[model samples]
Target: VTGDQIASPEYVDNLVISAYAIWATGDDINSSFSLWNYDVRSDDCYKGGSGTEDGGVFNALEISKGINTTDWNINDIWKRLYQCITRANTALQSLDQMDEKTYPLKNQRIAEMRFLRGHAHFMLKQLFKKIVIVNDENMEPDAYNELSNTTYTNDEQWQKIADDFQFAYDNLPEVQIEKGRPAQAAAAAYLAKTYLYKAYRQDGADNALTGINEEDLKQVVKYTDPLIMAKGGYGLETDYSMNFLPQYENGAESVWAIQYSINLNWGMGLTTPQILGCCDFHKPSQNLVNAFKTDSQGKPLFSTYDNENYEVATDNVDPRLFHTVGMPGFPYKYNEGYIIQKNDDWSRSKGLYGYYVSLKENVDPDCDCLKKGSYWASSLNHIVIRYADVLLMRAEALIQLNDGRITDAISLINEVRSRAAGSTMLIFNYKEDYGVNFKVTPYDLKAYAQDEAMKMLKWERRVEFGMESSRFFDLVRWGEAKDVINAYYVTEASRCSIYKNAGFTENKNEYLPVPFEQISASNGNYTQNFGW
Candidate 1:
């Protein structure tokens, strides 16, 4: 394509096309396509006709069970990421060669390319552990093959991945040229996250024992400080529900989101409908549902009943309860008349402990398809990254470094809670029984900070980023994926009928094995992750 084409009105469109190609590659390797399958079978998101026999749910549950075999499609996903990387590489290289005056948006275009490339590498490294780093030189097929055979140690690979994100952070434009293009702040956020991951990955002896290092924590502070201080572009949305509202594109809270247009035919044409509309994947479990309830004072109401009472419990919960999970009698956008009451038969058939689908993005006001039709027209922007996450990451890094700034972390978290509570309707109703109006105070991380910090950080992440494909990753990063999965399985065995045949062994199998096809193609060059 010409330089003008690269910087044309369709530039962002092209970038997304290329990015999706890479994302699809990762999806294949991770078998994330089974997310749909899992949603149907496992009842994690939605319950389909045959319950546990559902294709999408079965595949996801198998992957989570660490039982996936190597498939050619997995390798195709890896290669796809490379394809996007190459496209970005070409753009960056061409921009450098062009006369700067001729291409007015050259720098901006290159920056966007870097952001895509950086994200691609991040996804690859997260999965493969070691990926061949590509730039303009190796953008060619022959060069790619040559480098693919050369393996780098884990540390070396991580550093190379970090460099890609660093370049994006430095080069991306200060403001978004369009709604979808990456901005300087997004780059900074990603870089900060990259450094945090690197720090965490390297510090642990086996990726689990490793804790956050001081130097890495410093980078987290360094990168995020400007975004926080600039205060010009992003902040929390006044209403928590507004964040997921598809029409609210470029909402104040979003740092970077995957742009999906519903009305358009090209590029994910009507795919958004599948995610939020009729496709009922990403259902919230009773564990998550219970976690959302809060007392009148805005503190989480941890105990509603003596046991997991899915049938009886109803109101007096966090306002986010209605926003996140679709319960019976709750006003779902499309299923307004359909009550989502807890059904034991459906729960048994679906192989779930007990839960409901989150209403956040799934229920769109303008969803085209009603009951049987696909709600794919719910054109909500999938928020890939946001400011709230940045604040929490900083809070996490601080806790790891033991900087004695627990109070600060609590204050930052409270800011999110305050916004959720409503900026305009600021009502302090605490200790209603005693007729005492307690002012909501910022959390003090310093007092009982370490344990409290961990609890608060994990809880915030679990609640804030819930059901958005974050729980699995968070479990991995915290070095508790295997434990959490196994524990949940065991608990479900006792509480639900579906876990009768559920069993899993803890080992390196928790980490996804390199696709068998990829290993064979590498000619002994690629090494599988530990315990695979």
Candidate 2:
């Protein structure tokens, strides 16, 4: 493996695969490889299970209290994600050392490794706020130990991460033969997402959001244009449910996704076993459910949607709601054999988490994709950057810019809404079969001004990506998590007792503390996020 005559391609390929596999590490709650678990801290979910004590740390996190730097979940995520970064750096080192003829695809492979590195660091940036950025140049442990998490400003950190994806966008082929490998469009989508987050511009020791940056917003628009123009054949899956189903694993909408399989014998193949856990956790909150309700005109009842609980019998809803949440009367993951029961089976807390079960990450219990090892998990691929995300990110940037391009943004959002409108193939008979009323229509481009357009964009993002684990990060990027969550707590408290004293401390709760274990390991070089 060290010589040019040896097989560098196989060696490089193995390294890249291992890097992605590290991300889908199965069967451990402590791994935190599954970032969606953090969604419980947002208004989108409740840490529902046999009781609040089942995943007690999550319960503590949900209410915005009792979380400390020492929590194992925080510690492990920091370590596990950094481990992924290490694999990418190792691959880069090998590629750099080998001769160009020995590894003809060196630059392309380098771009791919950088994409993985950028992606891992992006997750760290979002959760930890200030994280030590690692790369091939500084792979030595002694050198890494001397680095500080605060070495870069918030904007500078985002740019460093963006630079990796920008390289990927420039070097990667527009199309890749492998289903799991990211195409050029994937990098563009990620680049746009990074800039969108940067555009919000958080400042100060507490990282209070100061204002939006128009130049950063332009970067978002710039990157998303090629994607919108169909650069890599990315588009919304005709049916919303298709995006989640195993049969459509590498579908048109999946810009980038982590591949998984039960063929691997070491329990690494299990992607999502929580759906079949002893207690169903990450149950969608009623607040999230209510957000799906639409008025008679097929528009979101933004102000008054939460005034009354959503009634499948009375209130009309976006069809994406049926695709997203598993309700009492609906088929679980579209399986008629496993209709979600109104009893404890659906909500192990017996309605404490409401009767809603998340549907996107799960499949039918009897699916061939389901495998039982030490834990029951699935073979379904986990999509990281779907094309719908690209559309919405561009829409948001346009809306925030408040330029005449707002109308163009509406067209992009309407494209998503129109897909939701047409996504009734599987649930077309829902009303007749389950008494669920589904209705969603596109916006009239002529109607919405900048304010209304921004509101629409935000709502579209929540509903479109609701259960996929992006909600909390999205809220933080818009600087709305503190206000929105506090408001959610007040209203949702009457519906669920667990939220009675729930609150969000604006500057502090925005990001998790730099894990205490990591800070200790840093030899005083690392500082905890403010308010930890």
Best by TM-score: 2
Q: Indicate the residue-level lDDT of 353 in model 2.
A: 72
lDDT of 1 at 91: 61
List the candidates' TM-scores in order.
Answer: 0.80, 0.95
Q: Encode model 2's per-residue lDDT on 264-351: one tens digit a residue.
A: 2222222232336554767788888999999998899989999988898899899988888887767887778777777765666667
lDDT of 1 by residue, 368-412 (tens): 421233223334565767778878877777777777777777777
Poorest lDDT segment (10 consecutive residues) of candidate 1: 264-273
Model 2 ranges with Cα > 4 A deviation: 1-7, 227-229, 263-277
* Poorest 10 consecutive residues by lDDT, candidate 2: 264-273
lDDT (Cα atoms) of all candidates against the true structure: 0.56, 0.82
